[PDB]
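## Example record

The block below lists the input lines for one assembly entry, exactly as stored, with component labels intact.
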Amino acid sequence: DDQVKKIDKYLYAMRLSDETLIDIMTRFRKEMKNGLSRDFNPTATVKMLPTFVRSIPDGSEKGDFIALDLGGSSFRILRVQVNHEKNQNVHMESEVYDTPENIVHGSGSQLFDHVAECLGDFMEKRKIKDKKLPVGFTFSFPCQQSKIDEAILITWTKRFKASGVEGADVVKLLNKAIKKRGDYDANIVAVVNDTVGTMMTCGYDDQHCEVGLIIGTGTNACYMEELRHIDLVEGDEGRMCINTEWGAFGDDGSLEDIRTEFDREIDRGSLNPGKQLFEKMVSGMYLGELVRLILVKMAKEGLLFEGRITPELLTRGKFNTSDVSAIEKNKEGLHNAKEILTRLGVEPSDDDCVSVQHVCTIVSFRSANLVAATLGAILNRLRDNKGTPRLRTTVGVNGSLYKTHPQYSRRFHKTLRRLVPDSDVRFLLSESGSGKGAAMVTAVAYRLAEQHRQIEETLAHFHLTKDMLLEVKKRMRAEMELGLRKQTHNNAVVKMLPSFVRRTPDGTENGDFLALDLGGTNFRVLLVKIRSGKKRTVEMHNKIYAIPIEIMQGTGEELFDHIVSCISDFLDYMGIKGPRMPLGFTFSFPCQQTSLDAGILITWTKGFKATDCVGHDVVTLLRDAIKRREEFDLDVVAVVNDTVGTMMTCAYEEPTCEVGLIVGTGSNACYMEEMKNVEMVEGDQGQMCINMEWGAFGDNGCLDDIRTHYDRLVDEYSLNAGKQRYEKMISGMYLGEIVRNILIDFTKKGFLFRGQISETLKTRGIFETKFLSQIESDRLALLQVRAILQQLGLNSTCDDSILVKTVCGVVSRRAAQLCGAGMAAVVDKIRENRGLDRLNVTVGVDGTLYKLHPHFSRIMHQTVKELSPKCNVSFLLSEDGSGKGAALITAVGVRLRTE
Amino acid sequence: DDQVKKIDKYLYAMRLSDETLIDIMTRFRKEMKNGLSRDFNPTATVKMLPTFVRSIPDGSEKGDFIALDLGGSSFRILRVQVNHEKNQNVHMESEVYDTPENIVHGSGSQLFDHVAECLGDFMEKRKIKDKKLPVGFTFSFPCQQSKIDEAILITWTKRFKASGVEGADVVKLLNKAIKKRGDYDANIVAVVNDTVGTMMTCGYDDQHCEVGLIIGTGTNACYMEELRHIDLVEGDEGRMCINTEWGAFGDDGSLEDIRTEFDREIDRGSLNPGKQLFEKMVSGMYLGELVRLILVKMAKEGLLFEGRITPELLTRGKFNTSDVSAIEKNKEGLHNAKEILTRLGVEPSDDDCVSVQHVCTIVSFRSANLVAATLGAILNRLRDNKGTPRLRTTVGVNGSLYKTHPQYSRRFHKTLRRLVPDSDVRFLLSESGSGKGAAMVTAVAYRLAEQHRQIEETLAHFHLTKDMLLEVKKRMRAEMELGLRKQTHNNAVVKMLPSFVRRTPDGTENGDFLALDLGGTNFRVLLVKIRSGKKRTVEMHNKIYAIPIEIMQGTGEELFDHIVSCISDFLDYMGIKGPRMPLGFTFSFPCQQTSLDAGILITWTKGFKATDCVGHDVVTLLRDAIKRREEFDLDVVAVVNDTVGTMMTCAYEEPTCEVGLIVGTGSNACYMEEMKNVEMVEGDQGQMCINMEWGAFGDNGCLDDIRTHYDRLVDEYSLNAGKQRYEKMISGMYLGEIVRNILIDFTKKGFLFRGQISETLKTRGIFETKFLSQIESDRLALLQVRAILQQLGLNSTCDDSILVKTVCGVVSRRAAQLCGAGMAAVVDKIRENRGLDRLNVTVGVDGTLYKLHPHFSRIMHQTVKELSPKCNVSFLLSEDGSGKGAALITAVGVRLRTE
Ligand SMILES: O=P(O)(O)OC[C@H]1O[C@@H](O)[C@H](O)[C@@H](O)[C@@H]1O
Ligand SMILES: O=P(O)(O)OC[C@H]1O[C@@H](O)[C@H](O)[C@@H](O)[C@@H]1O
Ligand SMILES: O=P(O)(O)OC[C@H]1O[C@@H](O)[C@H](O)[C@@H](O)[C@@H]1O
Ligand SMILES: O=P(O)(O)OC[C@H]1O[C@@H](O)[C@H](O)[C@@H](O)[C@@H]1O
Ligand SMILES: OC[C@H]1O[C@@H](O)[C@H](O)[C@@H](O)[C@@H]1O
Ligand SMILES: OC[C@H]1O[C@@H](O)[C@H](O)[C@@H](O)[C@@H]1O
Ligand SMILES: OC[C@H]1O[C@@H](O)[C@H](O)[C@@H](O)[C@@H]1O
Ligand SMILES: OC[C@H]1O[C@@H](O)[C@H](O)[C@@H](O)[C@@H]1O
Ligand code: NA
Ligand code: NA
Ligand code: NA
Ligand code: NA
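Predicted structure tokens for the full assembly:
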């Protein structure tokens, strides 16, 4: 019996006590938490990689799929089919392809060309190249994943070392490999670890399976973790499968007290020195060589074959894990030991066979015990996660060692069940490998990819290319010409209305003025005091006055009676009732003007429809309401569009400013034009500011080209169907409605909100400028987004929130680009007007969407820079409102009136 | 009692039950939590802004300071002198500067010009213009700060509305206005809120002060929060003052059930509509106007003065909060109300006076109550942070309303104490204002600014401009010349040794080869099989062999006996013991060669110093060690440098790979030179690979220009003092040592580790390549950085971690650039040699530092691209060591021999 008690003492370090295993396990429980923490992950050796599989197959899976399986004993390509509706039970065929060492060690090219070729063949035989079969990929190395169809190889393991793969995406790599062939089309939809594939395969038959275990060439386990623990994945919704990659357990020295001189020597001879140190004590790629190392040591010390030592005993790999298994068998154990050893050249005695067989025991008993240590850890995590006093789950298993060895399973289970007695675990041996599980994943992944494809399809219609934007710019410029020219003005949609403001502030404006600001979100009355000279100053006051639902769509008399009523109040407020003051009237709707102080409303826009206004001179309507009340007198000197008011406001301090842009409730622009071009106003000397009224761009159909189903819905249900189409794709009053309509469509499609169209979602105006601005804010956690949506009344999940955010960004991005194309046309015409090669001009901007939105202005400026590269445009934000500029314009009105 | 009975019923919504107050208090509580969370902050109206003030004064403050105070009811500039070590407690002189409307409502430019001008007038009269007086800036508006001397205005409040300031750093704006004057210098070293200033002022006198409260023109409060609760500031150590900016409480509609029609109306006339809504119910700027609006409402409804109404009563601002105070005085309240109302034009009756007074009462009482609720939330907050049943704290206070109102303080205090039971609260009214506190902050800020200045000054020596880098390139080019021309070779530092490798693999290399890899981090023996012809493959194996310290610096005989010992073991491992295989020797040290198979060790580099090796032919030393065993024999065909080996390994695949580079333990490079320029070897036909041994660049002093005190220390303490200068600023064996020496210096100066130079810090090697690469890993968390350092033995804080990361980054960056300039020289020489205008060549790269570092390669590549623009350089990383290329050289060796 010394033959055994002696070995026992020698390989003493490789016989771990329950005491020790307990510590190993405790240490893995820590390594798991560290690997899950957003803070500790970057340092952790156990990556706890997220796999993006949300749960085991439920049975709803159906279709036809192709599965790949690389990285294991052999490169396997399967085919799985299922359709319970048509009562078609799971069916599958599979084949194996040869993979010579040279390819496994060559460049990724040689390799992924090889896989693509074996796939080309596999489909050529069954004649399925023409069928749009979804491919699933079982790739069994640690991988960086942000989506199920992305796999960035973190590092080769086992027997693979292929150049130019680590850090790359094997999906794109495989794809490219195929492409080169042109032999077939292949839709790689998913990539899973064999651990994950194995958990899925068993989960399919056992609804309790929460773990995926592999003990073959390599070792590694996956399990079902709570999202509220995967710090590295935005979400708390249910669970997800974590690929622990425990092979690398201890690559940081955490297990140096467990590793022996033998582990260190096998390491120094390994393909991946320093890495996968836990695995190197476990999987079947190493066990055989470990034994051979121990046997070489003993032999060198005479403990075996006297001390005869052959060159074959010193040769790397002469001693397989096959031999380890064969030697461990109960009947032919020693018979085989003798044979295997005789082939080695040594002179195997019957005693030698018995010693060698015991070594094999020690080495294999250890591996099995280690896996029991770590797997025990996982189960401890599960029992904890839940909170139940006991644990009852199923563990899927696979791999050559576990399947072929005649003592491993038995031993492993026993040690495991012992370590965690509070568990009723059931081991289930995968019989299809990963195929079934893989395909069960490819099925869900494809399902999800189809929705996505459709989402992208619809959203793609909102994408505009450099060229399409150049066209829009070109169409804008053509429309501008049409509006300026007397022969075409009547049919032009872009009216190019003269404002009768001939120059920007000349610094002689002086006096006290009243002003109205009507048409934007806030109607207000203002008092503006301007003092010129050495020390020039501006002093303003204002008061917002609400305009009731009724009054805003009521009779004209009511509207202006209200306005004047508000003027009265403000005069009291300022303590200036009495004197007859001059008044600048900022009225933000298209007006036909014959002079600065006359403006005839052409049409209501935005939210206003007051009866008996269109066709009248708004300055007259105002004077009437003034005489009607009869309290006080005013001298209405001017009527100004907010674009022009804005340009003048900014021109005050910025003499380079000659353009006015509004992007708020509505959208519109103005700029300084040459009188010779304004064919609608007699005289070709000097300049005049032109209120473009560009919102009506597209009203003659010139944009049907890029308007979508959702744009037409918004237009069709608006107060002014058919009009202001350009504006309706840009401004805050409308952007939300576009988004809303898209979301309704997506919900009916079943993409959103579990397919339930909320009563809220049917409320128009739900997505205000404010909401859209908040939703699109940067680095804004999904949790906050979802919070905002629930605030509106929208019951939504993380996925919903993501989709909504995407949608808002697509709509607002397009708004900024279209706005940019118009402005690009404008500044470019100015450049040509001055006959310049380069032009520096500044735009005065205002509007709630422009001020609040986190991307609009940025993307807008970008677009203008790219579309009019011969112009350097500066956008200046107006902080005072239009009042200043209106006052400044009223000052000139007075001098020319008092002229 | 009738009069008050009815008024109470009329303004019912402005009288707040403790039930309501406790309601509001709970709300603010939630709002605080939201403002502090990284998830909800972006949508929270209460901003909870970090202040970067760690604690109240600790008595160590001392110096001469200037303090600005803007945003309050008056613009003040002060001077604070604090000298404890000189009986000089705290002395201050202040001066008020008139600040007219126009300035406060005009352009940011005027505003800060005006400030800069006043600061000038101030310093002029005191003739202190010449002293280095640090400036602290009290700016009572909400600001985003990443550090104490930065202040980005978020939004104007109170009476301010100057254009071009929101979103800007008021500190820059001020310096800008100062530099535009030319009158003086100003060291603005800190910016604080007035609540912070107040807290620090009271804290000076009362060590229990944990809150600063303002109830004047505007209202706000700050308090000491635990750093662990402050998400927006990385760190969990200690506390920091938080500026709640509680004026914006309710701006999201949070307090609409509290807000009345009067609040809504005062809003519509405010300078900032829809903002600071909570503040608009509380502070002095609003309380009076709020009262007026009620008198007007009541008058219109008959409830006052028979219902009479005057233009005065209807005017904005005719009823100041000042009048509110007077009318609430015990003795003269009603008498004062008589005078006030009689001036307003109405015919005040004794009842009117009583009615009015009771109005003021309700208004000011609500104000006080509201503040009690929010302060209560804070107090309760402070307590929970301690986790104790009771709370004892002092609240610093200031503001015109709180100071001058005859009832407010009392009522405020009353309600507060009733709302927070288990707490003793002292209300210390700041008599000096916030100026003293501001100065206390300034003192610590300056003290800190001085540390940064010195640190930045030190680190700047590691900064290299594009120009400097061009020089390094130029100098490198010169050295290359000297090394090639035999006229100057002997004296040249960069040796440009000939490798006697004349051409990159031609594609015919065939056979089996042995290889040695000695000089890098791992010594290994390799077996390499190269099959040429129609099908070309390369199969290689290898084993790592540890070279024990002793042996590494023992005797040449022991070293090479060890080498040959391992060669013997590997032959066993591979099972090829017997045949006389050709061997390729990769020897990573400078060798004088007269032929491919002859190499004289010129000198040791890196960590090697075996004796009686230098001056010997390393092939001879090997062949000898082999003879000394006689176990076997071999055919050493070549001695190769790792640069040459790496270039060949990579040129095997890429035919434009004419350059080699190593950035590992050491740094060096090789390239294909033209025999004409290789004056040291007879002939001018064909080409030859030149091992530059560029590490010795600088050994002749040609870099003394950029080498630093720390470089000299690292060099002076090395095994090869004075040699390999260039390399010591680049490779993994040295960079860590540069860092360690900088850290030691910084620690003595007292910038790091509490000035404690630990035993760990004294240990050389501490900052290995591995560690150095983790620390700089992109987007790594501070705790992660702190964790790793703690793991080293360096007990360090978060600030400590910040500095260590910065240091590491400066060193690694310089290294990458220096390396880049070297390569730029090399590639550009080849370009010119071949008289090309543009050159496309690829470089084979190897080395742990190059592989593991998160920035080196990126920065290096970028530098090459920038210094040699007429070159397009590609970097191919060698994934399988120098072995391949070495065998490829062996091949052409045995061949050219027989051929
Ligand atoms: O490497 P081994 O011993 O074949 O075991 C692991 C393999 O087991 C197979 O059955 C699975 O299909 C593969 O996905 C897995 O990689
Ligand atoms: O429609 P919005 O978002 O209110 O923006 C446009 C308005 O912006 C205001 O700032 C201008 O003073 C108005 O003249 C203008 O109509
Ligand atoms: O608004 P008020 O009445 O000036 O009160 C607040 C001010 O109080 C002063 O005492 C402080 O010095 C200022 O920093 C602060 O802004
Ligand atoms: O010094 P390091 O970090 O090991 O890197 C350089 C070494 O890298 C190895 O990969 C090469 O095979 C050696 O030839 C080379 O000397
Ligand atoms: O094949 C089984 C295991 O081998 C390990 O070495 C790999 O790192 C894992 O990806 C895999 O689960
Ligand atoms: O308010 C911005 C713009 O809105 C457009 O719909 C109006 O027709 C314009 O007059 C106005 O400038
Ligand atoms: O000065 C009183 C307070 O007024 C508030 O409105 C400001 O935003 C604060 O910065 C300031 O502390
Ligand atoms: O190993 C990298 C490099 O280190 C240098 O210091 C040695 O002198 C070279 O021979 C070698 O190429
Ligand atoms: Na998560
Ligand atoms: Na004209
Ligand atoms: Na923090
Ligand atoms: Na020569």
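Residues 663 and 847 of chain A are 5 Å apart (CA to CA). Chain A has four domains: 1-38+208-430, 39-207+431-448, 466-497+656-877, 498-655+879-899.
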